[PDB]
Design a protein around this ligand. Structure first.
Ligand SMILES: *[C@@H]1O[C@H](CO)[C@@H](O[C@@H]2O[C@H](CO)[C@@H](O)[C@H](O)[C@H]2NC(C)=O)[C@H](O)[C@H]1NC(C)=O
Ligand SMILES: *[C@@H]1O[C@H](CO)[C@@H](O[C@@H]2O[C@H](CO)[C@@H](O)[C@H](O)[C@H]2NC(C)=O)[C@H](O)[C@H]1NC(C)=O
Lengths: 86, 233, 88, 233
């Protein structure tokens, strides 16, 4: 009806990440103007590993892990067709 | 001439938590104290290690060992030794293992057999560390109240020795599935919970790099067992 | 020029705690005109969460062997969008 | 009568990696090996610990200490002593700390001051371990090329003094923000990157439980500096 068909894709992020392969749903026409197809960004957390005091690992109160490192990762997870914020 | 990197107990001393934890929950000891894992009391034998490097990525190494009734511990040794020491614990009977690399550095593998409680016998000196796959696929429909599609995937290999692979697969109506293929004579990747007329994609990472491979699951008329046990034209 | 309320189906955000035992503690959940035959669905997306010592370490999908025994990665589907796809 | 749970070096021995890392990465040593932290060489003094339990949830404990020039190590001690020991390291000058609990068990807190090299002085005996907030909020719009909204949140406290809090906040068009409030006279929570006419929600977890609180960010005509510095229908 008023929706955009989306395409699935894979993000490798290297083997150093615990969640290596990530699912990304991009925007790949209906829902003609004033609405236009945007990609809904969603932030997921990935667990990488040992580096030289790089940035600040997302809060994981350091006990067992600085051997590993938490990082935020925004990714397309849907293709919305809302007119809000263009 | 090549170099050598002997084990460093002063640093290896700190893997005891890892080794004892990983064994405390596995072998299910009464307590943790009864581990008796000591890296500073273990020596070095004349015995060369039987380890063999089968694969290596620019951030990892995948090797094979001989099947042992006991646990096996493996470490990567550098000269400087400042960053945490890479290591891996091969569970008994299993023979394949992996060791992680972080930087472009030479390492040397060192192996050990663990006791029932994790006593380290003397270290054995190991070795030193320093175009497009084509994919075929087959499907099978299965009947039980509903219907289910299982899909098997295969691809060719170069004339090189011992190829490891990393496979990722996703479909429009199935959650992702990923796997890591240790070196085999002929690699194969299984997929389940597939559906009819689904637009899928599979990536195969290998020595020659990543190969992205789009593919569509067949229709019902394409699967004899589907067409016969369903209504037709 | 612009109509209101818009065609897009409403989506509401919520937080999933999953306890402090989860490495990713706080999870973002986006739950739910466009009259039938279509109905607003909640777009399920699978994310990975790690479990702690208390578990017998059940079957992880795929994690480095440095993180066995003590940790286990498990899939977690969560609503991440609201879309007007019909039933069946 | 109550019981007491003395430190177990045979198990505490395994926190050396943690303690040595947390100081190795902080004090930036030449290597890790120069960490002379030894739990088996540490004793126990007559000196009672100055630690004070300020809060505890059925999955954690939050305590206060006196400001020390040195690092401080804290552990929770049980009778059985099989599982790994809960612990926390308070950075110098800082005074508040937290210890996580596993299952419904009695624990005893034990504290220590760490040396420059991580030498543990003798343990000090600590203490034993065993309806809806209403929120007000204010917003401030700020101008910088574009405009941005900052929102401050506050809520009333019960008659009791010993209260810590856990805060979670989310909006329809702003990424999640979470925080943990140590015990204060009057709690307050700041929020940034808010926008106009956004339907937000904030959860406040406290001694009296969770309080979910929906709220909408004001319009431009409600914010004088917004309305004035824009066109006015
Ligand atoms: C699988 O077989 C294909 C079929 O030949 C190989 O593709 C060739 O790749 C080389 C590069 O190594 C090219 O120069 C050729 O032009 C390609 N030929 C074709 C027909 O595609 C592919 O290399 C093989 N893969 C492996 C891993 O051996
Ligand atoms: C903050 O003030 C409100 C205002 O009364 C308190 O809300 C009351 O909570 C009790 C239960 O604890 C109810 O019986 C009352 O009906 C509530 N008041 C109203 C007007 O509904 C709240 O308890 C206070 N919070 C703290 C932490 O002191």
């Amino acid at each position: 009806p008023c929706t955009c068909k989306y395409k699935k894709e894979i993000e490798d992020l290297g083997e150093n990440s615990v969640p290596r392969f990530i699912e990304t749903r991009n925007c790949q026409p209906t829902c003609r103007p004033p609405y236009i197809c945007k990609e809904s960004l969603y932030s997921i957390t990935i667990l990488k590993r040992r580096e030289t005091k790089s940035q600040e690992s997302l809060e994981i109160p350091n006990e067992l892990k600085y051997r590993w490192v938490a990082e935020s990762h925004p990714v397309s997870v849907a293709c919305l067709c809302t007119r809000d914020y263009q | 001439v090549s170099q050598r990197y002997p084990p460093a107990p002063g640093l290896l001393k700190y893997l005891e938590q890892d080794v004892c934890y990983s064994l405390y929950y596995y072998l299910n000891w009464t307590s943790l104290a009864d581990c008796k894992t000591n890296f500073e009391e273990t020596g070095i034998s004349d015995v060369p290690s039987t380890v063999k490097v089968r694969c290596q990525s620019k951030n990892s190494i995948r090797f094979e060992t001989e099947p042992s009734e006991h646990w096996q511990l493996f470490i990567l040794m550098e000269h400087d030794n400042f960053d945490p020491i890479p290591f891996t614990l091969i569970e008994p009977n299993n023979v394949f293992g992996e060791l992680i690399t972080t930087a472009n550095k030479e390492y040397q593998i060192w192996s050990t057999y663990l006791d029932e409680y994790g006593t380290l016998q003397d270290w054995m000196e190991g070795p030193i560390v320093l175009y497009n796959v084509t994919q075929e696929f087959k499907y099978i429909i299965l009947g039980n109240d509903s219907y289910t599609i299982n899909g098997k995937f295969v691809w060719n290999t170069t004339g090189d020795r011992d190829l490891c692979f990393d496979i990722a697969n996703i479909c429009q109506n199935t959650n992702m599935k990923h796997a890591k293929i240790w070196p085999t004579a002929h690699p194969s990747f299984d997929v389940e919970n597939l559906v009819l007329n689904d637009e899928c994609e599979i990536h195969v990472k290998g020595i020659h790099g990543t190969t992205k491979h789009k593919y569509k699951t067949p229709s019902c008329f394409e699967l004899p067992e589907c067409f016969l046990n369903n209504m037709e034209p």
